[PDB]
Swiss-Prot record:
Protein name: Endo-1,4-beta-xylanase Y
Family of the protein in this entry: Belongs to the glycosyl hydrolase 10 (cellulase F) family.
Upper taxonomic lineage: Bacteria, Bacillati, Bacillota, Clostridia, Eubacteriales
Gene it is expressed from: xynY
Residues of the full protein shown: 803 to 1077 of 1077
C-alpha cells in the first residue's frame, strides 16, 4: 500500500518511532579482513528475517568523526525507525548495512574499492540478498536490489560509490554531501553522466534520491550540483520512480545533525527497490 508521489515532502517519523519496537530486527556485528585491513560493520536484519527469502540490501555510511556503530547507537537510533516502519507496512523488509570508511588506508573517497571487493562478497555470502552468487557476475545481476547512501563525508562516499559502482548498485541516497570531483557543478554532473554512459544502463536502471536540510551548510554546494544534473538527459526529475529517477528532498528548518537526517531515511527508503521488483505490488 506504499504509493509513489511525484514530489514527496519532508515529514519526520512520529516521535514514537524513536523508541524501541517490540518487532525488532536483529543487529549483527561482523568482522572481516579486506584491502584496508581488519574492520567491522553492522548488519540489521528485518524482524521475521527468513534465510529462504531474498531481501533488498541498503548500505549506509556514517559521517566524519563517526564509525560503523554510530547509526545504530543512541545518538541516532535508526533501527527503531526501521523496526516501527517495517512493522507498520510503510517499508518493505530489507537488510541495512552500516560499514565504515575508517581503518588502514581507507577514506570516504576511496571506500568504494573495499566495498566492491570485500564488503559485498562478505555480507551477501552470509545474508540472503538477491545475489545468487557473490562473483562479479552474480553481484552485477542483482544490482537492482542493492542500494547505497550516507550522510556528509558518507554522502561524499555515496557519490564516489555511484561513479565507480553503477554495475553493482542501482539506488543512491546521498545525504548532506556533494561530489568533490570537478572545478564546477558541470564537471560534477558530466563525470556522473560519463559513468552512466560507460555503464550502458538505461534511465530506468539507476535512481538517485538526494536530501539535505534548508539549515544544513551542505545545501550550498549540493544544490548547484543537483541543478546541473537535472539539466542532463540522463535524469528525469520526480520522486515517482515509476516515471523518473531523480529527486532532491530539502527539509525546511533542518540542520546538519542525525536527529534530522534519520528522518530523510524514513522519507526516502520506502521509495527504493520497487522498479523490476520480484513481487506483485501496485505502487
Amino acid at each position: 500500500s506504499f504509493k509513489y508521489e511525484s514530489a514527496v515532502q519532508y515529514r519526520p517519523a512520529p516521535d514514537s518511532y524513536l523508541n524501541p519496537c517490540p518487532q525488532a530486527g536483529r543487529i549483527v556485528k561482523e568482522t572481516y579482513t579486506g584491502i584496508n585491513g581488519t574492520k567491522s560493520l553492522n548488519v540489521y536484519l528485518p524482524y521475521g528475517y527468513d534465510p529462504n527469502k531474498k531481501y533488498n540490501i541498503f548500505y549506509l555510511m556514517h559521517g566524519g568523526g563517526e564509525n560503523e556503530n554510530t547509526i545504530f547507537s543512541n545518538d541516532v537510533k535508526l533501527q527503531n525507525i526501521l523496526d516501527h516502519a517495517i512493522m507498520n507496512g510503510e517499508l518493505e523488509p530489507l537488510i541495512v548495512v552500516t560499514p565504515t570508511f575508517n581503518g588502514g588506508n581507507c577514506t570516504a573517497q576511496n571506500f568504494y574499492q573495499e566495498f566492491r571487493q570485500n564488503v559485498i562478497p562478505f555480507v551477501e555470502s552470509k545474508y540472503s540478498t538477491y545475489a545468487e552468487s557473490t562473483t562479479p557476475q552474480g553481484i552485477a545481476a542483482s544490482r537492482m536490489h542493492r542500494g547505497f547512501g550516507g550522510f556528509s563525508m558518507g554522502g561524499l562516499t555515496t557519490w564516489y560509490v555511484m561513479v565507480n559502482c553503477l554495475d553493482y548498485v542501482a539506488y543512491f541516497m546521498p545525504l548532506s554531501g556533494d561530489y568533490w570531483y570537478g572545478n564546477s557543478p558541470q564537471d560534477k554532473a558530466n563525470s556522473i553522466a560519463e559513468a552512466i554512459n560507460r555503464s550502458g544502463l538505461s534511465k530506468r536502471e539507476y535512481f538517485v534520491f538526494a536530501a539535505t536540510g534548508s539549515e544544513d551548510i551542505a545545501y550550498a554546494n549540493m544544490n548547484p550540483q543537483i541543478e546541473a544534473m537535472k539539466a542532463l538527459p540522463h535524469f528525469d526529475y520526480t520522486s515517482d520512480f515509476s516515471k523518473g529517477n531523480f529527486y532532491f528532498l530539502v527539509a525546511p528548518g533542518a540542520t546538519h545533525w542525525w536527529g534530522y537526517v534519520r528522518h530523510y531515511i524514513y522519507d526516502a527508503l520506502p521509495y527504493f527497490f520497487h522498479e523490476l521488483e520480484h513481487h506483485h505490488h501496485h505502487h
